[PDB]
């Protein structure tokens, strides 16, 4: 019917159909669009290795949030509806933005130049790539459970202490998922034998004799 919309998309079709009309100085409108894109990119873009680490961490956090909501549904016997899907997606997006800022700290450290800051950024990037989960998250879960089970004055104290810290929103389901999973025995025996040596071996021998 050749309207404004149809004519606009028809005109946009051929320039990108070819390889000529969309180059560095051919289309000023496309040039301005790309300039804005690059202006935003140079600010919100990280270094490559930190980006890889951030991708791994974001994958882990997405999986954990999904596991939390699945735990809620399995426990309560409800059914996964569109409202649940939207809540899931919104929580995931919030957590991704939060840890995006966290890895903004990490990237700034990695690019600072200071040897100690670059060192710390390097070990944390390496841990993220190897997939070992953070200790900050462990502390967050422990503190959330402590707040849940604390009396009123203790709750107020911790809540006002941490209210400005900007910790991520953790679902009760996620905290309980962290807490519930059992603790391994080999790591415990290794740690006790390393921290106490012969006393550790003697204690573990006594424990196994009890077994």
């Amino acid at each position: 019917l050749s309207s404004g919309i149809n004519l606009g998309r028809l005109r946009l079709a051929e320039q990108f159909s070819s390889m000529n009309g969309w180059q560095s100085k051919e289309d000023p409108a496309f040039d301005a669009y790309v300039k804005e894109r690059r202006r935003k990119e140079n600010y919100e873009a990280f270094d490559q290795r930190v980006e890889r680490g951030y991708a791994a961490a974001a994958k882990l956090h997405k999986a954990e949030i999904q596991n939390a909501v699945k735990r809620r549904l399995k426990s309560s016997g409800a059914k996964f509806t569109a409202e649940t899907l939207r809540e899931m997606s919104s929580a995931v997006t919030e957590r991704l933005a939060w840890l995006r800022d966290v890895w903004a700290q990490i990237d700034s450290d990695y690019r600072s130049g200071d040897s100690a800051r670059q060192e710390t950024a390097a070990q944390e990037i390496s841990a993220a790539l190897r997939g070992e989960p953070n200790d900050h998250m462990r502390w967050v879960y422990e503190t959330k459970r402590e707040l849940r089970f604390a009396g009123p004055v203790g709750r107020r104290a911790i809540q006002e202490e941490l209210q400005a810290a900007e910790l991520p929103e953790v679902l009760d389901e996620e905290v309980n998922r962290y807490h519930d999973l059992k603790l391994n025995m080999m790591e415990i025996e290794r740690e006790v034998k390393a921290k106490y040596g012969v006393a550790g071996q003697q204690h573990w021998a006594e424990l196994q004799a009890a077994k």
């Binding site: 390889m19 000529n20 560095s24 690059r38 140079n42 390097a122 390496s126």
Partner: protein, 218 residues
Amino acid sequence: ELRLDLTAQSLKEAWMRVSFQSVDEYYASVDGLDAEQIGEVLAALFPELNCYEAQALVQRTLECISRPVSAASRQLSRTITAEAVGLDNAPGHYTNFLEWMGRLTETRAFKTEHALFEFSRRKFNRDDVRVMFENYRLMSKATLLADSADSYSHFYTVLKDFARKVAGEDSRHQIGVRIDEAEVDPETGIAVGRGCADGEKYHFTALLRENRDHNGII
């Protein structure tokens, strides 16, 4: 090629004697000097140099700011053709892509991954496997952890010799015949060689000398 490379380096050092790149300038591919400036200086300093050679010097001087030799694109042009990549009436884009691809191929990761590809294609022998085993054995645990950060360094430290082998006609060892050293008596200049046949029946030792005259008999 050597003439052009050295002239480009001389001009780059002259410019540095006389005098960082931003993202916009990098994308525009505008170096510290312009093609017109390079052409004018070359024409002034070198009268006899022809127009085609002057254009070549301009191109090489412009390109040495990025990569000194950049000989990979010239070769890759023969392997990959414009029609094949579907870029026939866009020579500028074709050359841009060829430079991009050659400078990427020159990278360490590219060599490591080509070596891995060939290993998967089974073009190694027991000698190559032994060399890889020696490299891995001498590689230490702390060095392994250090190279795991890069994720290509630990592959390369093991495949380095096989990386040479896979690049055949340009860098591959040729195991030729063994060449020993002469063993002749200094005083009488006699060489002693051995020969056997039938196991224990026929055994001979031949003494060979240089007959200074042209009258040699056996």
